[PDB]
A paper describes a structure:
Maternal embryonic leucine zipper kinase (MELK), which is also known as murine protein serine/threonine kinase 38 (MPK38) and pEg3 kinase, is a member of the AMP-activated protein kinase (AMPK)-related kinase family. MELK is a cell cycle-dependent protein kinase that is involved in the regulation of various biological processes, including cell proliferation, spliceosome assembly, hematopoiesis, stem cell self-renewal and apoptosis.,,,, and comprises an N-terminal Ser/Thr kinase domain and an adjacent ubiquitin-associated (UBA) domain. However, MELK is unique among these AMPK-related kinases in that it is not activated by LKB1 but undergoes autophosphorylation at the key Thr (Thr167 in human MELK) and additional Ser/Thr residues in the kinase, UBA and TP-rich domains.
All of these kinase-dead mutants were subjected to crystallization trials, and fortunately, the K40R/D150A double mutant yielded crystals with one molecule per asymmetric unit. The structure was determined by molecular replacement and refined to 2.75 Å resolution. This human MELK KD-UBA structure contains residues 2–335, which fold into a kinase domain followed by a noncanonical UBA domain. Notably, the UBA domain of MELK (MELK-UBA) binds to the back of the kinase domain on the opposite face of the catalytic cleft, which is similar to that observed in MARKs but distinct from that in AMPK. Binding of the UBA domain to the kinase domain of MELK results in a buried surface area of more than 1600 Å2, which is significantly larger than that in MARK2 (approximately 1200 Å2). Notably, although the activation segment between and including the DFG and APE motifs is disordered in most inactive kinase structures, this segment (residues 150–178) in our unphosphorylated MELK structure is traceable. The activation segments in the inactive MARK structures are folded into the catalytic cleft between the N- and C-lobes, which hinder the binding of an ATP molecule; in contrast, the activation segment in our unphosphorylated MELK KD-UBA protrudes from the cleft, which allows ATP⋅Mg2+ to bind, and the ordered Gly-rich loop might stabilize the bound ATP. In the structure of the CagA-bound MARK2, the active conformation was induced by the presence of the CagA peptide, which mimics the binding of a typical substrate to the P+1 loop in the kinase domain; however, the P+1 loop in our MELK KD-UBA structure distinctly protrudes, which would obstruct substrate binding. In our MELK structure, three residues of the R-spine in MELK are in perfect configuration as observed in the active MARK2-CagA structure; however, Phe151 adopts a distinct conformation due to the mutation of the preceding Asp150 to Ala. One disulfide bond is intramolecular and formed between Cys154 and Cys168, and the other is intermolecular and formed between two Cys169 residues from symmetry-related molecules.
Author numbering: 2 to 335
Write the structure that this text describes.
């Protein structure tokens, strides 16, 4: 059984999403009693995608940001790969919307600034997302966005350095050239997707939408959309600057960060740099672990620092999160 190794660190809970690429189960990390989400993949099912899944994980390991969903633990079995991630109760973007017909300009600005923060960080690390959509946008118990920075939807193709949108669900949020599989400079692809998001937040429907798939396909490639009466000029403008069929004509991140629409109620640009980066080990978390590991501090630190996203790394991070909730930094041992 592949689960035996996992089952000694976690007890399972009712599944959250069947989804395409991975089953996702809600779970309890035994040592800390904290909730986590676990992504379960089947290596035999994934087959040829497995190499890419591994590089996507390597990418995720290098992301530590206030609006990126945190990775805790990666466990590999003969047949399975388990990803353990921060759990986000608020649910997906529209689980968090509360089904309200649409958000006001200031209501969307609050959310949208967080999306910009997350994506800017990702780009700063030298990656593009290439699959920004509502189900990749979760909300934690504080109603802060946590982006899922991991996916198999957008994939590289060809001898050239091109990317292709693979998930037909993602279509309405995907840039034209990405859909065509002629996307290089994928970061521009991301600016397009946020434009779509921006539109939906303020309007309560998509700018390009059709039951027919070719029809929807064509509307996107053509780039024309309705502009509701209730959108402000500023809103409308920012939309135009993002929703450009020509990738080269889409607003740059740099100009997005400090856009007048973006700065309008805040008078400071999006703060996209990691506010919680890994500088030094938190002493309390270390003392707690060494109590449990029955060892000395330096030894304990050196061990955490290997930072293998093993059960140790997960335990460290969950204790860390506990301190941040203002909870006791304690383990469940005994």
């Amino acid at each position: 059984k592949d689960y035996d190794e996992l089952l000694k660190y976690y007890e399972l809970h009712e599944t959250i999403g069947t989804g395409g690429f991975a089953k996702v189960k809600l779970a309890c990390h035994i040592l800390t009693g904290e909730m986590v989400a676990i992504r379960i993949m089947d290596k035999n099912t994934l087959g040829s995608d497995l190499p890419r899944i591994k590089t996507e994980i390597e990418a995720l390991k290098n992301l530590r940001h206030q609006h990126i969903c945190q990775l805790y633990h990666v466990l590999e079995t003969a047949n399975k790969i388990f990803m353990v991630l921060e759990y986000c109760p608020g649910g997906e973007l529209f689980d968090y919307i509360i089904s309200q017909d649409r958000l006001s300009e200031e209501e969307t600005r609050v959310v949208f600034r967080q999306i910009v923060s997350a994506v800017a960080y990702v780009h700063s690390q030298g990656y593009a997302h290439r699959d920004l959509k509502p189900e990749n946008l979760l909300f934690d118990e504080y109603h802060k966005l946590k982006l899922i920075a991991f996916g198999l939807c957008a994939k590289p193709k060809g001898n050239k350095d091109y990317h292709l949108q693979t998930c037909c669900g993602s279509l309405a949020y995907a840039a034209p050239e990405l859909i065509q599989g002629k996307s290089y400079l994928g970061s521009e692809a991301d600016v397009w997707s946020m434009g779509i998001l921006l539109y939906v937040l303020m309007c309560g429907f998509l700018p390009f939408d059709d039951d027919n798939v070719m029809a929807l396909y064509k509307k996107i490639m053509r780039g024309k959309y309705d502009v509701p009466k209730w959108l402000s000029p500023s809103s409308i403008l920012l939309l135009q600057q993002m929703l450009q069929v020509d990738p080269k004509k889409r607003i740059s991140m740099k100009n997005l960060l400090n856009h007048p629409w973006i700065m309008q109620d805040y008078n400071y640009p999006v703060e996209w740099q990691s506010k919680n980066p890994f500088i030094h080990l938190d002493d309390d978390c270390v003392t707690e672990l060494s109590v449990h590991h029955r060892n000395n501090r330096q030894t304990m630190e050196d061990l955490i620092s290997l930072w293998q996203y093993d059960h140790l790394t997960a335990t460290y991070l969950l204790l860390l999160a506990k301190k941040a909730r203002g909870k006791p930094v304690r383990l469940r041992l005994s």
